[PDB]
Amino acid sequence: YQLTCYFTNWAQYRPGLGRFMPDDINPCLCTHLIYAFAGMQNNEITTIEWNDVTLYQAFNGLKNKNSQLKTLLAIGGWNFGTAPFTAMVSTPENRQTFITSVIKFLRQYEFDGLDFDWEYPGSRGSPPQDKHLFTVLVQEMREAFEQEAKQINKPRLMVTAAVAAGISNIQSGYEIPQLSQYLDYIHVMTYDLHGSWEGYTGENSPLYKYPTDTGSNAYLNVDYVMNYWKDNGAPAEKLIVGFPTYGHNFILSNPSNTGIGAPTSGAGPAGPYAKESGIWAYYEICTFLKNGATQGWDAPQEVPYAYQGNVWVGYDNVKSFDIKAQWLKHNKFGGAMVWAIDLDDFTGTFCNQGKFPLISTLKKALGLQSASCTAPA
């Protein structure tokens, strides 16, 4: 199995114990590390933070401590939108300009591949032709990577993609069988499945449906989403299950109505470290639990929740990560990806469960505890 972990270049700005840099990553924890995010300018890949080059160096330098570790650079993200992707795929000349720039960039900065995070082809402003043009882009990149590998006599750069979990988004976004042929891995974003936008409490990454999930709501779980991708043409072995080390929080409309599907009035408070409205990092959730919140367990969905006063959070813990890991193995998927390494309790000081408790749970369950960890020759 793969254990693929995303690092974010804005974690560096968090106060005190929240500050997370590339050198805070245990090089032995994950099989793959992915750097979020690169941007785009004039159809070429670019940095987005002032110190990205320094951070790339520290990030890829982790490979000097683990000979088997591979790194990728993710381009895009939710906030990036679609406009630059649409313009880039719109002409073969623009795609060539992009692919050329990517080969140069990855080789220059010592990344082992590119993770596409276009959210998403065919939606959020992206026109219908982008569904097919995305397949074309990925194929051209894969083939360019194959050709480059042989011309310079080095291992081939990887091409992967982070992909939608929403059924409507998948249908308008991806030619699954064709896309699957050229991607090395498919990073399925099986989280953000519920949020305050719905006006009631719901889980971030439930494994199964809740009894009340009717109609299209029955699609809002990890099991349905992974199987949808599989049944519609993606090989299980290339499919990578999404694991969140954060939760979504809510303001309860009634403080003593605290179950799944309880009325909410909006997003819950930003955390004191990550400072993200409606989102708490796992370690931020541990503070909530320490401060007296009542622990809940969503039995049908195999995930925890917690509440105190008018604040409710749906999230994942060691227990739920373990349950999902076992399910993943039973279903013979390629492994797990984690958003994000910097949101796990990396210091170990918040949750008292050891350093990186959530990702460590996956490392153990996926048979990677004895994985080789030695500097390269």
Ligand SMILES: COC[C@H]1O[C@@H](O[C@H]2[C@@H](O)[C@@H](NC(C)=O)[C@H](O[C@H]3[C@H](O)[C@H]4N=C(N(C)C)O[C@H]4[C@@H]3CO)O[C@@H]2CO)[C@H](NC(C)=O)[C@H](O)[C@@H]1O
């Ligand atoms: C809100 O202020 C903090 C900080 O936000 C940065 O934006 C990022 C956050 O909103 C991320 N959310 C969480 C819960 O971490 C968000 O994460 C998305 C990501 O875009 C998607 N891509 C993937 N994978 C697997 C490739 O997974 C998804 C995750 C989880 O939903 O990402 C946005 C950025 O897209 C700000 N940064 C940028 C670059 O906009 C900024 O640093 C801000 O201060």
